[PDB]
């Protein structure tokens, strides 16, 4: 048996390789980005945005974020999804973005995901899987984003209920807002300190 | 075959989050332990990238940004295999790489090192592994880079890489180094990895029989991702 | 002190003239043995070069040929001491060096390698040692170079050097390599030297405390020339 | 005690570092060359020229040659000369040249040297010390050039007489010629084979 | 897959042409070094031999020349695999073998050794490797043979073999020996090979589980040929 | 990675295994030989003949020779030929012969090959690849045979021009003769010494 | 010679700030990493102390506080050299020392140990190094001292010392111990130093040839400070 | 090359050796102290005072502090100062003090320093270099004291601007006050915790 290749920080220039446009490098015709909504994509459009803070309360302006999620019916656009249901054909389920170098704000344009089956016949509340990479972070940090308007589903979610310190569950719930008809969920991530965001080993 | 969950990540084979010798980790590491969860469909699935969207020079760092001439530096080919921990090939995984140029200079707004910029070098590439888990790209060997951790800190020459494969649980970003570089022994970033055998797993090896005469050298570097176990009894994934 | 002759050159510490693994030596080596002679004034004297004729950038390979910008590549300082075999410093010796650029390309009409030329790099420098036998120059680390000995032969990165010192008998041209380069173990030119300890005498060592932060690395390399014996009885030199 | 640094071939590009002009590199204001005659230099001007041949009888077109010699009175312009005589002040005693890339011809403009003291009260015939470096040559080869018009002095020369194979002594004697009032000594060097030039370990 | 050139032959893994201990090499070795060339279609191609032309006993040296009875001597099967240096099987390669009989006597006009001739033994065979690179032939173990190098020189028991495979650059003729033969350590022909590990690569190993009861012993012997590199960028072969 | 099996001399009886007929052994129904011309083979028939000499100038009477070449249009009868052109279907491209035990003469009956593509868009002059094995020869010696009536093509040949000692190029050119309407190319090989034939590491 | 900056302090050669086994460090260590800076004139300069102000017994701890008689305890001389890391002597550096008396008792208001006070011993001295970097002082060997870290903690016998030298960056305070003291192996303060070789750098060695008969023993102890690099190209200090 | 002698804590009795007067030991005629102002010293007299706090917010009553600074014109009284300017002849530039055993207060009487050249032609804002030693501190902690009335100079200071967490820069600025015509700068040091003082590796 082999050992997993060890992780190393993405470093401060993670953009050169993963978001060349943000570093002003035009070498690719097709560029991966933070827009998961195609014209025919099904579902309600939402904007997910926030900042990532370090232990001093300062935003990380060099952080790279990716999200992975199911479509509107809770099916993953992946060959490993075993639900036997047809997934939305116009949905990648994944996106990548970088915090703005000046403000530290990051965002994605996506769709609110449907509920996905949990283990042993349970049902998971709607969520988006998120990972963070940056200078100073030796291994990508995994977390999840749940939605404050799904209180009933959140209360029965297996993963949230597996966090024994109940007070920390709230760090995983994004707050719904409405900027000009657009639905926006705000999710700030606190890497260290008070109200530290829960991170998972998945 | 009915697949179950990925095997647990062995935390002793990776660096810890808090590693005081790498100074920026002090404020960017959680103080709470990670919460381990049992995997669901969310962790065992991942996106698919079609080869159709990749350009013909996406894996050729020597030519993909060349404008007026060739970039300056040591021509090298890097190749190898991506496998999971049980030895199975990892097919159609997205491999992205980025690095500095021959001077140790990154084409990035935040890099002000005096090492000279090369107008014909960009420093990023990508490729999909094939059915045998094989990948190959060509580039200019990067130069070591000074940085401020302690004041006279120097990274050994390295190429940054990222893999998106079959399951989200396999998601990994790391860096590989070149056989014989003396800076490898002094780097505080490489020293965040606890074991000597794991530090050696990041060193690409000179592959002399695969050098191309009067043209390019070659380095071999294999990558191992987490692997899925098969299920023969109860399938509790869903 | 009355100086006598230089000590005999130890032929077992040097390569032989005929060394079949280095193919061009087959037709360029004498078949007769060298004839050893007792030294005269002709062998113990040598020319003197005045510092006055040297320009301010003669020992700065990074800037002495720079036109529009800086050369591309790894900034490095090389320094060390030249001593004779009895440990005495060699003062005011002329040290000349030449090398390829970061791509492994020489600025020479006969070099057609595809490695890119650098318009801001020339590749030659010179300097005089000081009273302590110390020398220091700055350059771009050269890249390894393919050449046709066997078809896929590659020289490790190297800098060529020449010394003219106190006696014609000390005249020497050689090359030094960089600590850790894996090509050192395969080079047929380096293998013409019979002993492993002598091959190691040509490897410049990383000198980490002398790196200059956010600027240049540094390598230490000392050189030993033949030394003169002192005479206390009959002086037969003349 | 330390061991001498081992020799290595000068290689095919020895010109970059030792004769940058021949490689078309103008980085030095003062360039070392093959002209040892300054305007006030004393002595009879001579031209020394020839070719260097490999074992197939072909000229080396990448060879570098240096010479070292005494002034017209047989004094070396070196602090190590112990004769107590004043040397010509306008004479370096050393020069360097490269064979032409096309023809293989090399030359120096110098002065015919005077006789220099040999060991134990002997007198050496007039000679120029010469060294050869090139791709394929692992250690510089040392030889000497004597003059055919100094037959009497050559016959009594200590070094020539130390060569026990008398037939090889002639390979060290250059032939005097006269091209337009100029005195020219032709000295061809045969590195290997028939009429191989004598090389010394000095 | 687009194939490029065969990897360079490693001359240090083979005997040199001039090897004074093997006396006839003194006048039959070039004095000039070999000239290495970059490969073209001429070097990467080779002929094809159809199995149709091979008789049913071409690989059976025990019966292919038998007239009145069986040859005298030790019945043995030799088998193994032919692979290239990167481990790929070599398919449909022509393997030809020849050897002396049990007495150490060759059926050749120029052999006058007193060891007795065997009227039922010829001493040559051939076969094509299969798709797995496997070959198998049966013969009589040959006896050691005296010859005049030094006056009392003796070759260890050996079988001569030749391979014509996929590329002309792979063309090879050599000899294999039998595990435990004490003459192996004294043979000047085997000693022309510089390294001990390479000398051991010519020794066929006893394969006891594959002996055939009350019939024949068996030796295992694998052969490695030069291998082709794959090309992923410029294809300069033509 | 594995190391190539080391070469060993073919030895004095190389004929038993490679040309059993020359050793008077009839064990094979089909015997490989020195006749590459079949009745329907296309091209001009030529005879290639010569002797192989050792360092004393004496012929080797125990030498074994093979040749490999393209058909009349310069296509190799090999699956590795990538020209996309159809090869002559009645041509093996390979042959084997032994020098006569008494005279040392060897010969092949073949066809003059057409020009084959060289690397990087160049064109090779017509040539036959030849290998020599014998007692005393530790590794088969590779050389090539070019034709003196292809002077223009030879002058532009990449491999011939890669030999820097121009004087040795001529050892690779066979001389055209005409014995009774038959075209004969004479190519003598000198393994060692004066006019030593060029051998390649391929 | 134009001096550049002091070489970077090697943090792995010193104790870390937070070292839980030395309990008072838990609340007196910063949680943030140190910020490294490039040196300026502020860091490379330091004050000068004139010898004129030093009294004749400032380096004689046996007599500088003696009132009615001599202090009780083992008479010892301690001497040695202060050098920088490149081996250069440190001239005219201010060396100050302090220690307990023979009972392990400090003449300090906050020390209430029952070990007896000595009315003729003070416990502090100072001196300037000479041009060779040499220093010498005489004292009474101090006794080991119990203290409350864990309840039964005991410091090995030690002398505290401080150096103010040529640059503020060299400022250092440490302690040295005596060869053979068994408490050296158990001290949590000495164990804050990560490496065994560095712990040994604080042990003064018995110097038997320098004992003074019927009078005093002698210990040798050398000290190494950070050293300045020389600049041969751009001088960015100002 | 040699390794630096490793640091060890000064311990609780650091006063015996460095401030014998505070421990009531009169062994030296000349005693080093916290008064850098001599009668003829040039410049404006200031008093620098404060306390050092541990991680519980309690003052260290056993801490020893030294300062090093330039004179009123920004010249250091050190042979290593390369400005070529004459320094004030009545100024040591250095002082040492201990916190009071009861209150924990420490102070120095000095002069406000002039601006000193920074690297590469820059100018540093006025500052005093300060080091702290005490029981519990394994290596002396280095910091700097800048002045709140030099806001313009502070904004352009190279070292302050090299601290990327801008919020921490303020911990290095002392506050100007005026007690009876005397100018006093208050600088409290927080070794650990909230508003932790920046410490440098110099
Ligand atoms: Fe990097
Ligand atoms: Fe070179
Ligand atoms: Fe045989
Ligand atoms: Fe103490």
**How far is D150 from D154, CA to CA, in rounded Å?**
6
The strand pairing partners of F129, in sequence order, are: F68, F144
Chains touching chain D, criterion 3+ CB pairs below 8 Å? C, F
Nearest CA in chain C to D61: C110
Number of domains into which chain A is organized: 1
Cα-based distances in Å from B13 to A195, B21, B199: 29, 18, 9
Which position among B158, B219, B226, B228 bears the catalytic label? B158
CB of G41 less than 8 A from some CB of H: yes
Q: Is E106 a catalytic residue?
A: yes
Q: Do the Cβ atoms of H147 and H185 come closer than 8 Å?
A: yes
Which of B179, B169, B172 minimizes the C-alpha distance to B221?
B179
Nearest partner of D46 among D77, D67, D32, judged by Cα: D67
C209 and G232 within 8 Å at the Cβ level: the answer is no
Of the candidates B126, B155, B226, B228, the residue annotated as catalytic is B155
CA distance D12 to chain F (A): 14
Q: How far is the CA of B27 from the centre of ligand 1 (A)?
A: 20
Helices (H) and strands (E) in chain B, counts: 2, 14
A94: CB partners within 8 A, 6+ apart: A36, A66, A67, A68, A69, B46, B47, B164
The C-alpha atoms of residue H16 and residue H14 are separated, in whole angstroms, by 6
* Distance separating alpha carbons of residues D56 and F8, to the nearest angstrom: 30
Judged by CB atoms closer than 8 Å, whether chains meet at E8 and C149 is answered as no
Asked if B212 reaches chain E (Cβ–Cβ under 8 Å), the answer is yes
Could you tell me the two tokens for A182?
Answer: 């657009």
Contacts of D167 (CB under 8 A, 6+ apart): none
| Alpha-carbon distance B126 to nearest alpha carbon in chain C (angstroms) | 23
Radius of gyration for chain C, computed over Cα atoms and rounded to the nearest angstrom: 19
Q: Is B179 on the interface with C (CB under 8 A)?
A: yes
Interchain contact G53–H (C-beta under 8 A):
yes
Q: Which helix (H) or strand (E) holds C197?
A: helix C196-200
Distance CA(A200)–CA(F138), nearest Å, equals 66
- Annotated catalytic residue within G155, G177, G219, G228: G155
Q: Give the C-alpha distances (Å, rounded to integers) separating G120 from B123, G70, G158.
A: 74, 6, 19
**Whose CA is closest to D18, among C65, C164, C139, C103?**
C164
Catalytic residue among E65, E135, E145, E219: E145
Structure tokens given for E170: 């792979």
The alpha carbon of F39 is separated from its chain's Cα centroid by a whole number of angstroms, namely 21
* β-sheet bridge partners, residue C86: none
Task: Label residue E228 exposed, middle or buried (CB < 10 Å: 0-12, 13-18, 19+).
Answer: buried
Q: Do B45 and A81 touch (CB under 8 A)?
A: yes
Residue of B nearest to A191 (CA): B30
Q: What are phi and psi of A150, to 5 degrees?
A: -120, 45
Q: Which residues of A are part of a known binding site for 3,4-dihydroxybenzoate?
A: 135
Of C136, C209, C213, the CB nearest to G232: C136
Catalytic residue among G126, G158, G226, G228: G158
Residue corresponding to tokens 């020189």: E153
**E83 is an active site residue:** no
Per the CB < 8 A criterion, the answer to whether G137 and G66 are in contact is: no
Q: Three-state SS for G60?
A: strand
Ligand 3 center to E104 CA (angstroms) = 9
**Alpha-carbon dihedral G149, G152, G156, G159, rounded to 10 degrees:** 50
- CA–centroid distance, B83 to ligand 4, in Å, is 58
Instruction: Quote the CA–CA distance of H107 and F57 in Å, as a whole number.
Output: 103
Write the DSSP assignment of B123-140 as a string of letters. Answer: -EEEEE--TTSEEEEEEE
Strand partners, H142: H131, H200
* G99 CA from centroid of ligand 4 (Å): 6
Nearest to H115 by CA among H155, H75, H169, H174: H75
The two beta strands, E75-84 and E134-140, are antiparallel
End-to-end Cα spacing for chain C? 16
Taking the Cβ of residue C118 and every Cβ of chain G, the question of whether any pair is shorter than 8 Å is answered with: no
State the DSSP string of A124-147.
Answer: PPS-EEEEEE-TT-SSPEEEEEEE
Kindly state the tokens that stand for E156. 């260890």
Structure tokens at B171: 């998601």
Q: CB contacts < 8 Å between E and F, how many?
A: 267
Question: Cα(E66) to centroid of ligand 3, in Å?
Answer: 21
In sequence order, what DSSP letters do the residues of B39-104 get, joined into one string? --HHHH------GGGS-TTTTBTTTTT-SSSPPSS-EEEEEEEEEETTS-B--S-EEEEE---TTS
Separation of alpha carbons A198 and A181, rounded Å: 31
Residue pairs spanning A and B at CB distance below 8 A: 267
Hey, what's the torsion of the CAs at C21, C22, C24, C25, to 10 degrees? -90
Burial B148-181 (b: 16+ CB within 10 A, else e): bbbbbbbbbbbbbbbbbbbbbbbbbbbbbbbbbb
Which residues are bridge partners to F155 per DSSP?
A: none
Contact status, residue H70 vs residue H93, Cβ threshold 8 Å:
yes
Task: For A183, list phi and psi in degrees, rounded to 5.
Answer: -90, 130
Per-residue CA distances from E215 to A47, E60, E76, E218, F167 (Å)? 82, 14, 9, 10, 61
Half-sphere exposure of residue F12: CA atoms within 13 angstroms, side-chain side: 17
D68·C198 Cβ contact <8 A: no
**Is G108 marked as binding a ligand?**
no
Burial of E66 (0-12, 13-18, 19+ CB in 10 A): middle
Whether residue B224 contacts residue A2, with contact meaning beta carbons closer than 8 Å, is answered with yes
Nearest to A92 by CA among A142, A51, A43, A38: A38
Partners of E37 on chain C (C-beta within 8 Å) are 151
- Produce one character per residue of F133-169: b if its CB has 16 or more CB atoms within 10 Å, e if not: bbbbbbbbbbbbbbbebbeebbeebbbbeebeeeebb
Binding residues of C: 106, 145, 158, 160
B69: which chain C residues are within 8 Å (Cβ-Cβ)? 116
**Fold that domain G1-238 belongs to in CATH:** Protocatechuate 3,4-Dioxygenase, subunit A (2.60.130)
Pairing of β E217-220 and β E203-206: antiparallel
Q: What are phi and psi of D52, to 5 degrees?
A: -115, 130
Rounded Cα distance between D114 and D37, Å, is: 15
Q: How far apart are CA G125 and CA H16, in angstroms?
A: 9
Question: Which pairs with CB-CB distance under 8 Å and at least 24 residues apart come from H81-84?
Answer: H81/G41, H81/G45, H82/G41, H82/G237, H82/G238, H83/G41, H83/G238, H83/H117
C-alpha H64/C-alpha H135 separation (Å) is 10
SS3 C165: coil
Decide if A4 contacts B85 (C-beta within 8 A): yes
Residue of B22, B106, B135, B177 with catalytic role: B106
- The strand pairing partners of D84, in sequence order, are none
DSSP string over chain D: --PPPPP----TTHHHHH-GGGGT----SS---SB---TT--S-EEEEEE-EE-TTSPBPSS-EEEEE---TTS--SSTT--S-PPPPTT---EEEEE--TTT--EEEEEEPPPP-B-STT-BPPS-EEEEEE-TT-SSPEEEEEEEGGGHHHHHT-HHHHT-SSGGGGGGGEEEEEEETTEEEEE--EE-SSTTPPP-EE-
- Spell out which residues of chain F touch residue E48, defining contact as CB-CB under 8 Å: 77-79
SS3 content of chain F, % helix, strand, coil (to 5): 15, 30, 60
Please give, one letter per residue, the 3-state secondary structure of chain E: CEEEEECCCCHHHCCCCCCCCCHHHCCCCCCCCCEECCCCHHHHCCCCCCHHHCCCCCCECCCCCCCCCCCCCCEEEEEEEEEECCCCECCCCEEEEECCCCCCCCCCCCCCCCCCCCCCCCCEEEEECCCCCEEEEEEECCCCEEECCCCCEEECCEEEEEEECCCHHHCEEEEEEECCCHHHHCCCCHHHCCCHHHHHCCEEEECHHHCECCCEEEEECCEEECCEEEECCCCCCC
Rounded Cα gap, residues E228 and F119, in angstroms:
16
How many Cα atoms sit within 13 Å of H146 on the Cβ side?
A: 25
Query: Where do we find the tokens 């194979």?
Result: D165
Mutate: best of E44, E45, E81, E166, partner F, most F CBs <10 A: E45
Instruction: Give me the CATH number covering residue D70.
Output: 2.60.130.10
For residue E106, give the ligand nearest its CA. Answer: 3
Domain ranges for chain C, please list them. Answer: 1-238
Q: Which two tokens stand for residue C192?
A: 């013409």
Q: Which strand (E) or helix (H) includes residue B35?
A: strand B35-36
* Helix, strand and coil percent figures for chain C, each rounded to 5: 15, 30, 55
Q: What contacts B114, CB < 8 A, 6 or more positions away? A: C70, C75, C214, C215
First vs last C-alpha separation in chain B: 16
Catalytic residue among B6, B135, B145, B219: B145
Round to the nearest angstrom and report the end-to-end CA distance of chain G.
16
Q: Is C136 at the interface with chain G, CB within 8 A?
A: yes
DSSP E strand stretches across C117-216: 124-128, 134-140, 145-147, 153-155, 158-164, 172-178, 203-206
Distances (CA, A) of E218 to C30, E143, E211, E213, F35: 53, 16, 5, 11, 38
Q: Do the Cβ atoms of H92 and G47 come within 8 Å?
A: yes
Binding site residues of D, as ranges?
135
Kindly list the residues from chain E whose CB atom is less than 8 angstroms away from the CB atom of residue F59.
none
E14 flagged as catalytic: no
Kindly give the pairing relationship between strand C75-84 and strand C134-140.
antiparallel
Quick check: C213 and G85 CB within 8 A?
no
Spatial distance between the Cα atoms of C220 and C203, rounded to a whole number of angstroms: 9
**Whether C138 and G233 lie within 8 Å, measured CB to CB:** yes
Assess contact for H133 and H64: CB atoms under 8 A: yes
For residues C61 and C70, the answer to whether their CB atoms sit within 8 Å is no
Experimental method: X-ray
Q: Give the pair of three-digit tokens for residue C43.
A: 């062998």
Beta-ladder partners of H73? none
Residue in the structure block whose two tokens are 């790209």: B137
**Chain B residue with Cα closest to G30:** B26
Short-list B82, E155, G96, A51, CA closest to F9: E155
Q: For residue C219, what are the contacts with CB-CB under 8 A and spacing of at least 6?
A: C76, C77, C78, C79, C178, C179, C204, C205, C206, C207
Give the gap in angstroms from C-alpha H130 to the nearest C-alpha of chain B. 20
Q: Which residue of H has its CA nearest to G236?
A: H120
Contact C153, B208 (CB under 8 A): no
Question: In whole angstroms, what is the distance from residue A36 CA to residue A95 CA?
Answer: 6
From residue D67, give the alpha-carbon distance in Å to each of A138, C97, G31: 62, 20, 69
The Cα-based distances of E21 to B111, E31, F70 in angstroms read 64, 17, 39
What's the sign of the alpha-carbon dihedral C48, C51, C52, C58? positive
**CB-based contact, A137 to chain B, within 8 Å:** yes
Which residues are CB-neighbours of E177 under 8 A, at least 6 positions away?
E156, E157, E158, E184, E190, E202, E203, E204
3-state secondary structure at position F178: strand
Q: What are the distances in angstroms from CA H93 to CA D138, F176, G169, H35, H158?
A: 62, 99, 15, 10, 22
Which bound ligand lies closest to the C-alpha atom of B142?
1
Note the ligand closest to the C-alpha atom of G155.
Answer: 4
Question: Minimal CA–CA distance to H74: which of G165, G168, G236, G238?
Answer: G238
Distance CA D17, CA C58 (A): 11
Query: Quick one: tokens of C11?
Result: 């032929």
50-89 in chain F: CB under 8 A from chain E: 54-56, 60, 62, 66, 68, 70, 76-83
Instruction: Tell me the residues of chain F between 163 and 192 that have a Cβ less than 8 Å away from chain E.
Output: 163, 168, 191-192
Taking an 8 Å cut-off on Cβ atoms, the answer to whether B74 and C103 are in contact is yes
G44 close to H80: Cβ distance less than 8 angstroms: yes
Q: What is the CA H108 to chain-centroid distance, rounded?
A: 9
Distance CA E140, CA E101 (A): 7
**Dist. CA D137 → ligand 3 center (Å):** 41
Cβ proximity of C177 and C157 under 8 Å: yes
Q: DSSP labels for F22-73? A: GGT----SS---SB---TT--S-EEEEEE-EE-TTSPBPSS-EEEEE---TT
Any CB–CB contact under 8 A between B31 and chain H?
Answer: no
Count CB-CB contacts under 10 A for residue A121. 8
The Cα–Cα gap between C38 and C43 comes to: 9
DSSP helix/strand/coil, G217? strand
Range of the domain at D168: 1-202
Q: Are A191 and A197 in contact (CB under 8 A)?
A: yes
């Amino acid at each position: 048996e082999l050992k997993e290749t060890p992780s190393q920080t993405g470093g401060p220039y993670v953009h050169i390789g993963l978001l060349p446009k943000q570093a002003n490098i035009e070498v690719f015709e097709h560029n991966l980005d933070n827009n998961l909504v195609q014209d025919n994509t099904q579902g309600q459009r939402i904007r997910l945005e926030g900042q990532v803070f370090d232990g001093l309360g300062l935003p990380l302006r060099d952080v790279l974020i990716e999200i992975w999620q199911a479509d509107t019916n809770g099916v993953y656009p992946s060959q490993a999804d075993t639900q036997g249901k047809q997934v939305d054909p116009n949905f990648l389920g994944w996106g990548r973005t970088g915090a703005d170098f000046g403000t530290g704000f990051w965002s994605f344009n996506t769709i609110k995901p449907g509920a996905v089956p949990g283990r042993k016949g349970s049902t998971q509340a709607p969520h988006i899987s998120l990972i963070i990479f940056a200078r100073g972070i030796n291994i990508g940090l995994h977390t999840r984003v749940y939605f404050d308007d799904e209180a009933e589903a959140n209360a029965k979610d297996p993963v949230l209920n597996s966090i024994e310190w109940a007070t920390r569950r709230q760090t995983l719930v994004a707050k719904r807002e409405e900027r000009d008809g657009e639905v926006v969920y705000r999710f700030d991530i606190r890497i260290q300190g008070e109200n530290e965001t829960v991170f998972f080993d998945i | 075959i009915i697949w179950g969950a990925y095997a647990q990540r062995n935390t002793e084979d990776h660096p810890p989050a808090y590693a005081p010798g790498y100074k920026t980790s002090v404020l960017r590491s959680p103080k709470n332990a990670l919460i381990s969860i049992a995997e669901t469909l969310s962790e065992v699935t991942a996106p698919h990238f079609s080869a159709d969207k990749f350009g013909p020079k996406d894996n050729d760092l020597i030519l993909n940004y060349a404008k007026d001439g060739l970039p300056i530096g040591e021509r090298v080919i890097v190749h190898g295999y991506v496998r999971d921990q049980f030895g199975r090939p990892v097919k159609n995984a997205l491999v992205e790489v980025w690095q500095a140029n021959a001077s140790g200079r990154y084409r990035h707004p935040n890099d002000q090192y005096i090492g000279a910029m090369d107008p014909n070098f960009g420093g990023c590439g990508r490729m999909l592994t094939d059915d045998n888990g094989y990948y190959v790209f060509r580039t200019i060997k990067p130069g070591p880079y000074p940085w401020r951790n302690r004041i006279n800190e120097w990274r050994p020459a390295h190429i940054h890489f990222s893999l998106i494969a079959d399951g989200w649980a396999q998601r990994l970003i790391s860096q590989f180094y070149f056989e014989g570089d003396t800076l490898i022994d002094s780097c505080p970033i490489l020293k965040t990895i606890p074991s000597e055998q794991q530090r050696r797993a990041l060193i690409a090896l000179e592959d002399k029989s695969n050098f191309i005469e009067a043209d390019s050298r070659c380095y071999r570097f294999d990558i191992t991702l987490r692997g899925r176990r098969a299920t023969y009894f109860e399938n509790d994934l869903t």
